[PDB]
Design a protein around this ligand. Structure first.
Ligand SMILES: [Cu+2]
Ligand SMILES: [Cu+2]
Ligand SMILES: [Cu+2]
Ligand SMILES: [Cu+2]
Ligand code: NA
Ligand code: NA
Lengths: 620, 620
């Protein structure tokens, strides 16, 4: 009967029922976002109140609404009109992407542009992209999409191989008009196809790969009860799914003796942004917030057996709402399995004559998403030794442009005439901490070099220091790889047997953060991305590092507004936001389809246990 | 008939035969080191000359000798007496480790020390450690070992749980005398056992782990011919074994079309050092060069099936020499297998309606070694997409001391009274490059942030720069994680179809380098470890970054002496030396036996191919 259970189809149809009965979901209305709300803090001796949050867009053009519904009581808790010029446009609706190409086809400016390049409009695809906020005043309070053109020579052709550069169009998707068509000049269309299943380009496929067979004859070592509650090798959690964040982990905890010891209350990727570094006016506005503007959860792939996920796989098929409030199942959307992970520990002792080896493994929870040309895999891992890890795998087809004759400082060449603008992929993991409970504290730990002198006469000593982050005004931190900077989340009220606060250490990869100029528009909308680590005091309305409506919203929101409250985080209910990302100067090897690249982070115990927690792992 | 084949037992017994016949291996002589020499450059139309290098120690105390033998011709090429006070002591002999405890047992100073602490000498193990070079003048030209005491309460007890602090002894292992016994005061002996197979400490073992079965019903996709020549998924290499470096990879190359394209001519871990950061006079001298002083190859474990190595495993059993020149097989010393590696590439395209997924895998070549309390796994990986990776896995039992009452800035507490001095594990990978051949060049690539202004009006642009390292005086480089610094090795004379030099990019982990004071003795003996990347002009006598004899040798050797020649490295036969390491503030979870921690690096293609090299991978 768990309150962290996944949303069922019945609950979604019931939300729809409640909204209709209340006059809130007539035939002009559309769900832009629907998701279950996490139980409120405390909520112990108190039975549940399953609530759902909904953003309801109006196609006629009236003000949209934010609505909370209790499916427990069958009621609307609250409903309020939003002012989207102040607080930001709602997520882009799936039904509005189609509109961009359709409308552009009958627009004279668009056709004149296509005709100057000798292009047939029936062969010209348009990627409909999130618009952000810049110098266009007729855009504030409006839902705009920006269209970039790509030629498809035939229905099975990869249009990404044939970008139409020097051309961008802006479209208003509510009033259904083309607001602008910008043509900076004709660029030649890159001529080679990039059809990665065509034999002319692949050559004869390899016959040298012999099968690797991964099975579990007694089935998997984890259990799933209540739909989504996992127990595995002392670990305990609930796997949730939200249409925005995708897979969310709740109540991550570790069974130490007879004690269930919390570690992380909620773990999500709460934003991901892909800023482009090409100063071309055709692309200098390109910033996909895939989580915030698109809702990456809703484009989660169906994951096929012995192919996306290998081994003994347990699937979850999370349910979401479509634009009318009918439930939609995402079949096999979440993969769950365990894999071998080499050696856990090994020592061969001369003096005892005892030889000891133990195998490691990890629990994997994963989903995959597709937006346009981009494809991302999101993987959480739990290891036997208490380590928690996240990894993002980026693949898909790189976003293209023309390659300027004379070269470029901001674009690489993939094929003759074909460019790939430089860009980053930056993630924010929101980690609502609960190291042995909610009373937590972050310290920043740096290695300390010591001078040869009195007390260190051989000049070999080195040390470490820890600086407590006491208030949110001191809790916006940058990496220092050179001094091995990490951050320890500990519980000052829960000590280990050696009388030291229990903790977990966050190990970042220390990749570059947001490169854009600090005065730029993306540095303001994505302020989280300019720093590696932020710590806030928990509040229930502080969910996203960019705020609740990213679509076409400037600064004034998210992390920088949260931390300004300068609240006490020294032995309180806190939340860690770790920025981490890939910086991509695309290479020839990324074309015509990109091999996986990865980025992530991990947390390892740090005096959390009283000794190794894997002493009781058996041989074999 | 390959000249990169592993040494056979017949060849080693033949080296012994040649040395005896020449009067160089009488009954007072001992092999401290024996290894096959790599073929000389050129060596194409010229048939082979299998040569072996040998260091021959004399137990009576005469000068040791360096000898090169040709087993082809059955001759001594050269033999020369060494002056070990000038050029450094030979590697420690396995037979000399035993001597330390034996001699100390009858030494009055040692027993007086043991008697003050109420300790029975029959229960006191002594770790015999490499001595380095410090303020002791009677040590230069002498082979000294330093002994630290650990109590074993019974024959199957882990003595590491009971360090005897405040006590160190120095011993001369040729003349068989105790030169010094230093007692700084009695420290209590840590009382808890750390027996990780004892049920009282483990508790009942888990029964929750269900088997994971990894098989290959058609066998593995790689072939091994000529003992050690591997072909796998376009890759080609020879797996070598040296008693010092362990597993060495020769002729790493990639089959692109009908062309065999070299990448790395030779890849090894050419040094590894573990500097201790505790200023105690009992430990401030502790610096194990496991590769240089001990020869980690000679302590390679026998790796057992379905346990150290899982799956379809092909073993190699490399042969080495014992102290008398008899061959010794290391049975199942090298594991070779292939493993699944998740998704290689995936895109689901709306416009084409084509959905595409491909699985990745990697070839693994690995060995494991044990020195005293330390156990290390050394793993090379080749991926389908042309990426090459190394990873070191550290485990074993942490080196202990007493934990000072009043705490320590240089030691953590693992159990009541038990300390673990802070230390680092630092590796040097020597990569003799051959990117499409021997004419290579290194550039350092940093991300470039750009100011918002003319030509970048939205403030979104970013770029990259590359700086060619033209001479060895400019080729000692440090990491800059913040600017995403990497190093590209390219061939200026071999261009891809887009007319850019082919290359591979080295991606470091950017962990801290040597923390010791730059004026310290370890900063001088291990000068390589103070910088992330060094590039030298290839020479055949420049093998180790510390020089040919590390045992008790000061500066004046290795990398800093190599680079001073200031040779041209811009489009020449070059060698990259990448320093990378772990900095360890030991945690409670590392006791009583440490879970694996890892560190490494990788190289990925960078315009090496004309497009993705995995286009011809089949579905499934
Ligand atoms: Cu085409
Ligand atoms: Cu990218
Ligand atoms: Cu004991
Ligand atoms: Cu260590
Ligand atoms: Na919290
Ligand atoms: Na070279």
């Amino acid at each position: 009967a768990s309150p962290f259970r996944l949303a069922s189809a019945g609950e979604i149809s019931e939300v729809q029922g409640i909204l209709r009965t209340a006059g809130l979901l007539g035939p002009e209305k559309r769900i832009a976002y629907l998701g279950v709300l996490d139980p409120a803090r405390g909520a112990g001796s108190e039975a549940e109140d399953r609530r759902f949050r909904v953003f309801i867009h109006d196609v006629s053009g009236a003000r949209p609404q934010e609505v909370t519904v209790s499916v427990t009581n069958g009621t609307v808790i609250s409903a309020v009109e939003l002012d989207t010029a102040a607080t930001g446009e709602l997520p882009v609706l799936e039904e509005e992407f189609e509109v961009v190409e359709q409308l552009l086809a009958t627009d004279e400016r668009w056709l004149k542009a296509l005709a100057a390049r000798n292009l047939d409009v029936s062969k010209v695809r348009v990627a409909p992209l999130s618009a952000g906020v810049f110098e266009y005043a007729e855009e504030r309070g409006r839902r705009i999409l920006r269209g970039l053109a790509f030629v498809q020579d035939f229905p099975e052709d990869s249009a990404w191989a044939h970008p139409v550069d020097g051309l961008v169009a802006y479209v208003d998707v509510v009033s259904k008009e083309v607001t602008r068509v910008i043509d900076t000049g004709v660029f030649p269309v890159p001529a080679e196809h990039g059809n990665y299943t065509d034999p002319e380009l692949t050559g004869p496929l390899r016959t040298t790969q012999k099968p690797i067979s991964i099975t579990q004859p007694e089935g998997p070592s984890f259990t799933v009860t209540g739909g989504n509650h996992i127990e595995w090798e002392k670990w305990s959690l609930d796997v949730g799914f939200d249409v925005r964040e995708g897979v969310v982990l709740h109540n991550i905890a570790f069974r130490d003796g007879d004690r269930l010891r919390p570690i992380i209350n909620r773990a999500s990727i709460a934003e991901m942004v892909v800023p482009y570094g090409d100063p071309s006016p055709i692309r200098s506005w390109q910033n996909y917030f895939d989580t915030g503007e698109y809702l990456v959860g809703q484009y989660a792939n169906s994951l096929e057996l012995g192919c996306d996920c290998l081994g003994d796989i347990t699937y979850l098929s999370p349910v979401i709402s479509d634009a009318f409030g009918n439930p939609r199942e995402i079949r096999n959307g979440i993969c769950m399995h365990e894999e071998d992970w080499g050696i856990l520990a090994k020592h061969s002792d001369l003096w005892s004559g005892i030889n000891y080896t133990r195998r490691n493994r990890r629990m994997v929870i994963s989903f995959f998403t597709t937006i346009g040309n981009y494809d991302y895999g999101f993987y959480w891992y739990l290891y036997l030794d208490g380590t928690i890890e996240f990894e993002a795998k980026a693949t898909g087809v790189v976003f293209t442009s023309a390659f300027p004759e004379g070269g470029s400082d901001n674009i690489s060449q993939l094929a003759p005439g074909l460019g790939a603008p430089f860009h980053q992929h930056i993630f924010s993991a929101r980690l609502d901490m609960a190291i042995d409970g909610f009373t937590n504290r972050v310290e920043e730990e740096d290695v300390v070099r010591q001078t040869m002198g009195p007390g260190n006469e051989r000049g070999n000593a080195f040390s470490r220091k820890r600086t407590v982050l006491t208030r949110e005004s001191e809790a916006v931190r940058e990496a220092d790889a050179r001094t091995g900077r990490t951050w320890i989340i500990s519980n000052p009220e829960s000590k280990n047997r050696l009388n030291e606060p229990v903790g977990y250490k966050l190990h970042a990869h220390n990749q570059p953060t947001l490169l854009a100029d600090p005065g730029s528009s993306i540095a303001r909308r994505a302020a989280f991305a300019t720093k590696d680590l932020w710590v806030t005091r928990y509040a229930d309305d502080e969910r996203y590092p960019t705020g609740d409506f990213v679509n076409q919203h400037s600064g004034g929101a998210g992390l920088p507004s949260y931390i300004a409250q300068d609240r006490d985080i020294d032995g309180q209910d806190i939340v860690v936001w770790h920025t981490f990302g890939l910086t991509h100067f695309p290479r020839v090897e990324d074309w015509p389809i990109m091999p996986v690249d990865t980025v992530g982070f991990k947390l390892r115990p740090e005096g959390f246990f009283d000794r190794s927690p894997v002493l009781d792992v058996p041989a074999n």
